[PDB]
């Protein structure tokens, strides 16, 4: 009896939702915000995870890691690494796997963490965020990612979930999670037998722009076309401006802010804040204290100037809308509504620039911050063994053609296209292979020139074991079950041998009644499962060994944090006990404590007071309950002869 948790792992901030009390609620965190910041940062005694990490952004700038979701599966030498690190702040380094990772000063030492392991860190925090709000148990997770994520990164971010000890029931394309939101709430979608409603969804968030068009009917969405600009989000606007001011403070100030980390960074943060402000007002003041050489900066920006700045971005906007309709084999007037979600769709010029990209008004009927997450948790619920969900069918788009190959034994061919381009997923395909024995299979892209530069082409491979020939047979048909799963992942779900046998059945003839006699039987061949075969999968997923490894580090790092915080709890139970004791020696215990008894403490509180000011400002958990002990010795006693003496007396 544990709760479905869907997580919307956005580049700037995540939104946690849970399915419960027959609906889907959002979970608020420790600082009462409805979205945690997707930041992992590292102290000298603990980790700063989620909400805390952001505070430290300016102190801990060097051991603060954000952009979590973009370094997942990022090849260290990728021709675009530039575009990602552009936005970083901690140093990124290559790993054994040629993949990207982070160097951070943490628990005294240098440490190096992989994007998978960093992402596992954040997910653990929010898992906890939800654990505490639910008071209940948390295991299954459905996570939302950009549709652009590769079959690799889908695996990685899933393995992340595993390190932070959640089992990933599904990796879902985010805007499709918003589609499920839409589908399961809106109330008079067309009937199955009617033409469906075509709704385009546009999500410009912190770093990624995505536009996908879907067809809805009661209980049903099918995704018709999706097209992304993964280098177009709020963060690109934040620079655009930050750069304009950088020029000014070269002029009427002459500091090249592009000379200081701490400086550039505080202007950035302030650019962001200003921008949000011009989404509601036409003019906005701008000022940062002591940028460099004890200099104070002061300027402003008008909406008109803001927009004038971003014309470059405002011109990359229609590109994916065209690409989307083009793929969905649709024309723009066939799209009934266009719903905007995503933080940076709040900028009015952008609102318009997309309206004129579809040539109709925008609609805003989803909660445009919680829809990807809310829908994601519904999906998680689907996979809940303890829930019966409203029936809802959704098929996403499977853009690239994928074939499967196999040991050409007795078979004419050793491969075939299995999941065509533009088909939906999930999809299961049954094949039957003729087998002289054990064999190997592999899945890969049919035309590697269709995929983004430097995409491997090989996707996964399996080995099938335990093939065993009937008796006198030279070969054996094994039925395989190739499956493109609900996370988009290309698998082989099940494989077994089959064999014919003869099942003697009786022949009727109850027409005549010929003295009751002449019962005939016919041998009948019945094809039947023979043996179940064994599949070892070799995928981008991590092996049980390296998994438990990554898991034991998250297990330690986590429990060093859980001590670091379990300690400062006592430092408080003490401190609180100190105040509440002096404050009752007068307000309740004066009539109830002795007089010589009062100078026993008073008193003893006072050493235990300034105690908390050097030894220890930060002592050890041992001593924070140590002092609490002997202070409580003198408590109770008094406190009690009071309580049993007024309670009944």
């Amino acid at each position: 009896m544990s709760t479905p948790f869907g997580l919307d792992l956005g580049n700037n901030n995540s939104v946690l939702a849970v399915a419960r009390n027959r609906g889907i609620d959002i979970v608020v965190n420790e600082v009462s915000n409805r979205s945690t910041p997707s930041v992992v940062g590292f102290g000298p005694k603990n980790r700063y995870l989620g909400e805390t990490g952001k505070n430290k952004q300016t102190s801990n700038i060097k051991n603060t890691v954000a952009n979590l979701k973009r370094i997942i599966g990022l090849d260290y030498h990728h021709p675009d690494f530039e575009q990602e690190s552009k936005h970083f702040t901690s140093k990124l380094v290559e790993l054994d796997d040629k993949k990207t990772g982070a160097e951070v000063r943490f628990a005294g030492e240098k440490h190096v963490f992989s994007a998978t392991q960093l992402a596992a860190m954040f997910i653990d925090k929010v898992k906890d965020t939800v654990k505490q709000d639910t008071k209940a148990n948390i295991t299954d997770v459905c996570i939302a990612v950009p549709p652009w994520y590769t079959e690799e990164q889908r695996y990685n971010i899933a393995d992340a979930a595993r390190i932070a000890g959640l089992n990933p029931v599904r990796i879902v394309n985010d805007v499709t999670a918003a589609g499920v939101s839409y589908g399961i709430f809106k109330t008079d979608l067309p009937e199955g037998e009617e033409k469906p409603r075509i709704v385009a969804f546009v999500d410009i968030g912190h770093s990624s722009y995505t536009c996908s068009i879907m067809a809805f009917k009661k209980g049903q969405l099918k995704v018709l076309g999706t097209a992304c600009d993964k280098h177009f989000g709020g963060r690109d606007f934040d620079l655009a401006i930050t750069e304009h001011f950088a020029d000014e403070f070269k002029t009427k100030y002459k500091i090249d802010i592009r000379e200081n980390p701490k400086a550039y960074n505080r202007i950035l943060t302030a650019a962001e804040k200003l921008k949000k402000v011009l989404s509601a007002n036409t003019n906005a003041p701008f000022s940062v204290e002591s940028v460099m050489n004890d200099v104070d900066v002061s300027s402003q920006l008008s909406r008109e100037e803001l927009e004038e700045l971003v014309k470059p971005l405002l011109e990359r906007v229609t590109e994916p809308v065209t690409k989307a309709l083009a793929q969905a084999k649709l024309s723009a007037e066939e799209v009934d509504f266009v719903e905007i979600i995503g933080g940076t769709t709040r900028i009015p010029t952008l609102k318009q620039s997309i309206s004129e990209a579809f040539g109709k008004p925008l609609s805003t009927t989803l909660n445009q911050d919680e829809a990807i997450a809310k829908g994601a948790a519904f999906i998680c619920a689907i996979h809940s063994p303890t829930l019966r969900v409203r029936p809802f069918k959704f098929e996403d788009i499977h853009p690239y053609s994928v074939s499967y190959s196999w040991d050409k034994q007795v078979e004419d061919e050793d491969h075939m296209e299995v999941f065509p381009a533009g088909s939906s997923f999930p999809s299961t395909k049954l094949i039957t292979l003729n087998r002289t024995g054990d064999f190997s299979m592999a899945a890969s892209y049919t035309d590697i020139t269709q995929l983004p530069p430097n995409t491997p082409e090989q996707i996964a491979n399996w080995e099938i074991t335990g093939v065993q020939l009937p008796e006198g047979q030279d070969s054996v048909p094994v039925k395989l079950k190739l499956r493109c799963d609900p996370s988009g992942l290309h698998t082989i779900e099940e494989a077994y041998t089959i064999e014919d046998i003869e099942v003697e059945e009786p022949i009727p003839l109850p027409e005549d009644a010929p003295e009751d006699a002449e019962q005939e039987f016919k041998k009948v061949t019945k094809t039947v499962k023979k043996d179940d075969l064994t599949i070892v999968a070799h995928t981008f997923g991590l092996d049980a060994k390296k998994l438990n490894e990554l898991i034991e580090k998250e297990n330690e790092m986590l429990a060093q944090d859980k001590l670091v915080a379990e300690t400062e709890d006592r430092k408080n139970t003490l401190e609180e006990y100190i105040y509440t004791l002096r404050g009752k020696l007068e307000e309740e215990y004066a009539p109830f404590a002795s007089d010589a008894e009062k100078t026993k403490l008073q008193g003893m509180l006072n050493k235990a007071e300034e105690w908390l000011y050097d030894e220890g400002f930060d002592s050890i958990k041992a001593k924070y309950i140590a002092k609490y002990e002997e202070l409580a010795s003198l408590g109770n006693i008094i406190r009690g002869r009071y309580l049993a003496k007024e309670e009944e007396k």
Binding site: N367, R388, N572
Partner: protein
């Protein structure tokens, strides 16, 4: 096309909810904000409502109107309006007996009544509703504090209609909140309920009496200027202590540095309701200096010992004025974001002796919640999405090692099932109830979850006695299995110590299939035995 929204017109921030899908949805504004500020700001070009207005305050302070709620439907020479005219950096004229606020809209002079300011706030709340909902919005339930008098209570319904709303009904803030938690739907008797509304700058205790869902407003106590913003102040003060000390510089003259130290304390405050420590780190606070410090929660609760504890006062003065004792309040309800302060709850709960506090619903917006429920009820209400169910067939063991199911797998939860059993041998003293989970027909392929005994059945002939097992699951999935003797009334039960943690839908589906692969020989095993009945504590 035309639905029923519920609006909380509050002093500084208004909220707007709509009831769709069994629960209330709270609508966000086109800036992401669930609550919207009650500010209108006039300027030259055009006017500005909500965030737009509150953004450009301090660049129009003498033209950005607010707190119009503090004078809607009242007389210029009023007891409380006199005290009020003080802060508002805008002009408050008189147009024959009543108050009227006066401004620079388009450069010169114009003046609007309170109901007019408040009405152009609802207009935005209307708008905000209309955006999200798709169609247009006309019917609304608007809320007001229990202590409103018919004149201001009326001027509120005017704001409504001036704003093109069809104000279905005006209702109490305290009663809206009790609505949300649906106490006006709890089994008979007469109910006493205390709302404990601690905003960011207003406090309000109210005691209501409900019979048959009719709201009788017993008494109101409170404090006009008490909330969040106050506990903030203590911190700010306290930290200027610290900064002035640790640095010889005193910041108190810095309208920006004091602001930044303020923002930081509010954040820390919020942190301190969840953690026991918090941290303040303003890069370059004053004269290029960096302020980085911490603050403990006990230290926080200490700066406000006087303030917190003092919230207990309008409680006693409401408990009294309403002629009731502390133990006659059946339900307490936290409302407003300051009620999240562990200590304030700690104080309130103990005062009422460990009694539980209704606070599931974000207090930030409990009221708007209640109002959105009402506008439903008042408009005809304007399958199930999610259902809790059972993972595995539950049952007991029967003569043979058979599994006799009481609750079929995938049964809709809150459930009760009962099947009469009998005895296996004669003069059988007692039965052994063994509870099994699994989908196999033989308890040897299923999982034992627990066992207990019914003993002291009147000895009788093999087959007579009417033992009567019942499986009970509450909403939480707790399982009580109980056997009762029809004959005597002798009864024993057990509450299965659960274990859940766990099996995932795959696991079940693989379990379900094993049981389909053996249907044949499983079925032909209890299809050779014949009897549904339990054996004398003869386990196995």
């Amino acid at each position: 096309k035309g639905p029923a929204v519920g609006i909380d017109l509050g002093t500084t921030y208004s909220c707007v909810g709509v009831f769709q899908h069994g629960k209330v949805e709270i609508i966000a504004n086109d800036q992401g904000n669930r609550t919207t500020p009650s500010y209108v700001a006039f300027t030259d070009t055009e006017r500005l409502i909500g965030d737009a207005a509150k953004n450009q305050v301090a660049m129009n302070p003498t033209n950005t109107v607010f707190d119009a709620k503090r004078l809607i439907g009242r007389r210029f020479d009023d007891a409380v309006v006199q005290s009020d005219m003080k802060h508002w950096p805008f002009m408050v004229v008189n147009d024959a007996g009543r108050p009227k606020v006066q401004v620079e809209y388009k450069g010169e002079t114009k003046s609007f009544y309170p109901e007019e300011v408040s009405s152009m706030v609802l207009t935005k709340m209307k708008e905000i509703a209309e955006a999200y909902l798709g169609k247009t919005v006309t019917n609304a339930v608007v809320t007001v504090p229990a202590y409103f008098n018919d004149s201001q209570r009326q001027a509120t319904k005017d704001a409504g209609t001036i704003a093109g709303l069809n104000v279905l009904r005006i209702i109490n803030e305290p009663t809206a909140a009790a609505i949300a938690y649906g106490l006006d739907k709890k089994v008979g008797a007469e109910r006493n309920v205390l709302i404990f509304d601690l905003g960011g700058g207003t406090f309000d205790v109210s005691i209501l009496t409900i019979e048959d869902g009719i709201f009788e407003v017993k008494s109101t106590a409170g404090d006009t200027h008490l909330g969040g913003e106050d506990f903030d102040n203590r911190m700010v003060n306290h930290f200027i202590a610290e900064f002035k000390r640790k640095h010889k510089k005193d910041i108190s003259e810095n309208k920006r540095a004091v602001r930044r130290l303020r923002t930081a304390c509010e954040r820390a405050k919020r942190t301190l309701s969840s953690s026991t420590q918090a941290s303040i780190e303003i890069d370059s606070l004053y004269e290029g200096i960096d302020f980085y410090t911490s603050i403990t929660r006990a230290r926080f609760e200490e700066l406000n010992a006087d303030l917190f504890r003092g919230t207990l006062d309008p409680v006693e003065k409401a408990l009294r004025d309403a002629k009731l004792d502390k133990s006659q309040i059946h339900d307490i309800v936290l409302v407003g974001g300051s009620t999240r302060i562990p200590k304030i709850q700690k104080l309130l709960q103990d005062f009422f002796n460990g009694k539980e506090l209704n606070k599931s619903i974000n207090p930030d917006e409990a009221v708007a919640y209640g109002a959105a429920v009402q506008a439903a009820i008042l408009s005809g209400d304007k399958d199930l999405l999610l259902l809790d169910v059972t993972p595995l067939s539950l049952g007991i063991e029967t003569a043979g090692g058979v599994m006799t199911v009481l609750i079929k797998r995938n049964t809709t939860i809150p459930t009760k099932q009962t099947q009469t059993f009998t005895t296996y041998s004669d003069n059988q003293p007692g039965v052994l109830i063994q509870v099994y989970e699994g989908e196999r027909a033989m308890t040897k392929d299923n999982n034992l979850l627990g066992k207990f005994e019914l003993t002291g059945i009147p000895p009788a002939p093999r087959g007579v006695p009417q033992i009567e097992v019942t499986f009970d699951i509450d909403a939480n999935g707790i399982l009580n299995v109980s056997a009762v003797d029809k004959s005597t009334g002798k009864e024993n039960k057990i509450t299965i110590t659960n274990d859940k943690g766990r099996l995932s839908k795959e696991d079940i589906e693989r379990m379900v299939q094993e049981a389909e692969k053996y249907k044949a020989e499983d079925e032909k095993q209890r299809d050779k035995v014949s009897s549904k009945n339990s054996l004398e504590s003869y386990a196995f």
